[PDB]
Amino acid sequence: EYPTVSEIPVGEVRLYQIADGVWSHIATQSFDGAVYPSNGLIVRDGDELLLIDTAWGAKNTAALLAEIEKQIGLPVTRAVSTHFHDDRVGGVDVLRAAGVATYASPSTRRLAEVEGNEIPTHSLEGLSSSGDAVRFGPVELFYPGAAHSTDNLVVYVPSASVLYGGCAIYELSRTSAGNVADADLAEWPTSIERIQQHYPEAQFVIPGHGLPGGLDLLKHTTNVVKAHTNR
Numbered sequence: 518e519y520p521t522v523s524e525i526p527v528g529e530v531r532l533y534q535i536a537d538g539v540w541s542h543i544a545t546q547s548f549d550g551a552v553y554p555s556n557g558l559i560v561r562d563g564d565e566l567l568l569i570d571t572a573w574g575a576k577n578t579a580a581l582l583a584e585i586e587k588q589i590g591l592p593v594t595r596a597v598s599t600h601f602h603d604d605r606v607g608g609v610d611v612l613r614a615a616g617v618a619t620y621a622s623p624s625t626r627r628l629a630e631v632e633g634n635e636i637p638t639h640s641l642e643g644l645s646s647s648g649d650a651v652r653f654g655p656v657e658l659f660y661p662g663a664a665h666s667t668d669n670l671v672v673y674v675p676s677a678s679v680l681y682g683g684c685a686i687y688e689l690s691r692t693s694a695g696n697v698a699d700a701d702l703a704e705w706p707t708s709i710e711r712i713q714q715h716y717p718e719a720q721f722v723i724p725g726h727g728l729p730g731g732l733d734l735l736k737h738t739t740n741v742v743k744a745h746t747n748r
């Protein structure tokens with residue numbers, strides 16, 4: 518029942534409950550002449566919510582906050598953006614205006630500034646070196662090394678064994694890489710192996726775009742990234 522790109526109008530947001538207190542959010546956006554779905558995460562944090570990633574733009578992120586209030590009814594108090602691209606930080610200003618404390622690593626904040634993207638307010642400490650992990654409310658944040666971007670973080674939810682890979686992990690339906698202008702293609706397989714070694718118990722793996730699956734999504738992503746390298 519996970520919603521697909523054809524099932525979400527651009528401008529609307531859907532939520533999918535993965536486990537007790539854990540949801541993904543799904544939005545869509547027009548880019549380069551196609552329409553893409555995009556995922557983020559919502560994790561219950563006591564009587565508050567932690568948001569992982571915007572819904573890819575101001576309009577979608579306003580719709581995200583509305584759908585969260587409608588369907589969950591707890592306040593989003595903190596948000597973490599997992600890298601500097603617009604599907605992760607586009608909408609940070611909407612979050613900020615709604616009273617959400619927005620966070621990213623120092624590397625993400627700097628890259629967003631260089632790129633011209635919205636800049637989360639707070640800086641996460643302890644994520645500057647490959648293999649670093651820190652606990653941030655009900656999730657563990659992990660920097661696996663450069664992959665889809667040099668700053669990409671992944672997010673693990675220990676209570677539910679949910680691994681949110683963000684854009685470093687591809688859905689199975691995606692068999693080609695795409696625009697890897699900001700990617701470190703050469704390091705990406707090693708960074709995926711580091712995720713595999715640090716979170717081998719993950720039961721549910723959420724890619725940045727598209728359908729969730731199991732840990733197979735990690736090997737799939739390596740296969741796709743290597744195939745692109747060889748073109």
Ligand SMILES: [O][B]1([O])O[C]([C][N]S(=O)(=O)N2[C][C][C][C]2)C2=[C][C]=[C][C]=C21
Pocket residue numbers: 548553602603604605684694695696697725726
């Ligand atoms: O997913 B991103 O974080 O990564 C980059 C490059 N990905 S892309 O191949 O251009 N693409 C495929 C999925 C949607 C865009 C990006 C650019 C613009 C908006 C968002 C993103």
Ligand SMILES: [Cl-]
Pocket residue numbers: 617618619638
């Ligand atoms: Cl704040």
Ligand SMILES: [Cl-]
Pocket residue numbers: 618
């Ligand atoms: Cl704060």
Ligand SMILES: [Cl-]
Pocket residue numbers: 684695
């Ligand atoms: Cl992508």
Ligand code: NA
Pocket residue numbers: 665684694695696697700
């Ligand atoms: Na990519």
Ligand SMILES: [Zn+2]
Pocket residue numbers: 600602665666684
């Ligand atoms: Zn990206």
Ligand SMILES: [Zn+2]
Pocket residue numbers: 618619638639
């Ligand atoms: Zn603050």
Ligand SMILES: [Zn+2]
Pocket residue numbers: 602604684725726
């Ligand atoms: Zn993305």
